[PDB]
Predict the structure of Holliday junction ATP-dependent DNA helicase ruvA.
Amino acid sequence: EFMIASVRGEVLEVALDHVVIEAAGVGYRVNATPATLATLRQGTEARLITAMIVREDSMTLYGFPDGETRDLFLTLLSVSGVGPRLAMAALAVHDAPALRQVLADGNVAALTRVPGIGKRGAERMVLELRDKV
Amino acid sequence: EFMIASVRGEVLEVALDHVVIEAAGVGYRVNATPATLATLRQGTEARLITAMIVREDSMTLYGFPDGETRDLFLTLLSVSGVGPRLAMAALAVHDAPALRQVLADGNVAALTRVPGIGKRGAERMVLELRDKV
Amino acid sequence: EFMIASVRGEVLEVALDHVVIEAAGVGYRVNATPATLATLRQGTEARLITAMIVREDSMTLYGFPDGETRDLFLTLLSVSGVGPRLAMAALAVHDAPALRQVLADGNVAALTRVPGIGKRGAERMVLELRDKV
Amino acid sequence: EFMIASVRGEVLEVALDHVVIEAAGVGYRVNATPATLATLRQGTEARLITAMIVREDSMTLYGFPDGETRDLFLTLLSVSGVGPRLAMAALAVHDAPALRQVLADGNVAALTRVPGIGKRGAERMVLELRDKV
Amino acid sequence: EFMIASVRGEVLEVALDHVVIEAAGVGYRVNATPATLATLRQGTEARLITAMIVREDSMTLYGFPDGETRDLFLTLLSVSGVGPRLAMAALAVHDAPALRQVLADGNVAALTRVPGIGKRGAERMVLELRDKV
Amino acid sequence: EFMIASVRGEVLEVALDHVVIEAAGVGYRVNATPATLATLRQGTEARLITAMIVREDSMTLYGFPDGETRDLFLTLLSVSGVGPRLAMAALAVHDAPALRQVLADGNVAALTRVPGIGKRGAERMVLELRDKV
Amino acid sequence: EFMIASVRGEVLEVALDHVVIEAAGVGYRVNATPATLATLRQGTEARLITAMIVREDSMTLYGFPDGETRDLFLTLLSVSGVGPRLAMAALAVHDAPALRQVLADGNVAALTRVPGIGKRGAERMVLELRDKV
Amino acid sequence: EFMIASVRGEVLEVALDHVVIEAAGVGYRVNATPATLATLRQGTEARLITAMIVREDSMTLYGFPDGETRDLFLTLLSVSGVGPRLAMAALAVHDAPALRQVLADGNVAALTRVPGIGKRGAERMVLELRDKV
């Protein structure tokens, strides 16, 4: 239940945590992993499969090269103590496929190499997510 | 008081609870009954009459082939204990016309064949809705 | 501080409390006084100067033929006990110019001819609004 | 985490606290410093790098000629007791570059020439922002 | 999960929707059905089995001569569209035993004699409560 | 629907906006008009008929020598734009009887002598309250 | 940060999920494990070390024979997905000492014998709590 | 506007961040600086001038040997970024008189010796509080 799932248009600017994609006059700001960003050139058209996240005081967009990745993102968020910034850092470090498998396997060690994930965090994931991927 | 009542564009993807309709660069994600979905081919343009639903932490879009159906949807929601998922399941099982008449007639038996509706639920509807359809 | 102030496109449907204006694939639903509605034909392009109203559980759009009217609408809302439905009924009965002057003059009698406005209501307006128009 | 970062289209109206920029049928209302406004002619296309601000009961857009300015705006807001109206008045009086440097230098005197900023206010800024610009 | 279930002390005042019971220096204000009230004399000690009701902007106490009645009260409240004032009016008209049985029997007619209960209301109760009493 | 309507005990301290009344070990802090305060000596027992006011982030108690006054207080609060501090200042200046009659009579002039009440304020009262006293 | 940590007085009633303890005229309702309850006779004085739990729409009290137990209760609650009812059921089945040690040892099997705790639940505890007991 | 300003009774337990003071059967839990605590013996009667702090999900009590101290506490809280825990740590380190004067003098150095107060924090205080003490 996200509403905006892809945004396509001319890339106006590429910073290092985000990008602005002009879709019909409206410049949309989506954030993505540096990896995603890299493959993006200003001036050229581009399409991200996005997760949209709404709270009482914000609406942020999150971008990815495919929804199989975006979808995984939404999942990470389903863990108690997983914020967007975080999920984004997790993906910056474990590509979608790379991640899914760590989580099936219960590879704590792997996850632990992520900024902000102690033993306890890593394991809450594997526990709540092992079946789920 | 819904704001977005129809969304028209190229169908980017058709999953089984939803579809993404690109409307001018912006890929919109609407959900609909499998029935609605069926009649939808990727690649081709398409238009859904939508119910838009806003809460503190989400904005979901709900799609239908016509507003006479969409409108009925909004109504189902008007019942205490009727969530979107639910209304959607009710329609998955009773087409708009099929439903309206069950509800006028007070056909509990009929409604009961819906996933998630006991005697008590079915009757809250018929009671609050019998006049209303 | 409203965000969306006008919506222009092909009129998809004209009901009696509202209209849907397709603006680039997206069908927007604005509400307006029957008067406004009247001047509107389906099939044809059209532009309303809109008031957009956001709460925790809704976003409604309100349409008018000009912002001098729309702006007055926003004002009505500034009165304690004036809801959108109401402001809309007030305008359905007193055109923008017609209204502004009633309110400057303190013409309670006039306002009283509005559905839902007792002595007390009418006067809260004139009191809080007399200077303001 | 702002969502809408630029809006491009035909300028429908230029008032003195804001402007409406039609982006694909949808008239967007952004506010900006008179300075920004000045450089804007009705009838002509135009692009503002915007800050979008969402609360429980509103969504306002704020416009600037560049994001280096817009970005500074977002920052001002990061101070306890700095509202949008305010940040806008601060920029109306100190251009982006002009401001950044006042804040690095700790030039209270300068800031004090802003409507609504006593000693105490000015200093909360310099204190929380001196490093930040 | 109510917290305060009885309040015992000298009756300071008996009005017609409520009473103040001083419990150790603190004058507590509980509301009750006129019936309950009747049996109460100022000056004398007294004990009510109370329902305590907390919201974001209030804490009201509701009093009864016994918890078998108080408990029923809490139940009435469990119905969608049953406010405290209401439950209190229902009891003012149907004593606890009298009521329980109407609700088991499904005696709409009976309930209908209550101020504020149409067909539809009465039936929501019987439906959600028939098993429950 | 206030909960605590009187508090009786030894006066621990008398400041100029409030007093602490120890009721069984618990020191309660009620606020009152200087007038009320005056008649109060530390060391001695005392009883105030109180209005209790609960919000998401506070619970304040308001004290008076009688509930006919306290009750009027609650009423003042019933006006859009009347805060507790205010109602308290209004009573500091117009005793209960003095006030009730100003409000019946529509004596704006009188009310206007209150700190914080312009023409417009005074009249909102008289309008919403004239019948009510 | 609980406020009310013990309540002492005459036991007015002992039901099977709770008890009412009159403390100075005010009948307090605390809930406890059947075990705690057992040791309690109506008519006699009694003291529970309580956890007090406040939300926007309720204030519940939870009772125990000692705070070493009560304190553990508060802890259980510190787990994502642990509600009061739950913590209470956990203690109904594992006395305080019995529990602490299961949690240090990581004895999932043990915890699993609790109503409402699957593998995943049990382990979230042991993970977040193993160090903590 | 605090409600509970003192609590007097037999000290049931003295831990190192708090104490429980039984006031008429009800054991109240107040927190205080170790200093305050020290002077407190279990078994004996005792009185703290308290600050009471209410939020949507808690009510905490804060205790001191006098209100001149308690009052200062409330003030600390008036600073953006000053939480209760904090104010308590500040007082644990600077007695009331000691503190007031640091803040008048603008003695950042002094404040800096407090756990959790960088340059920036210390100065927000002195700035917002210098006049205020």
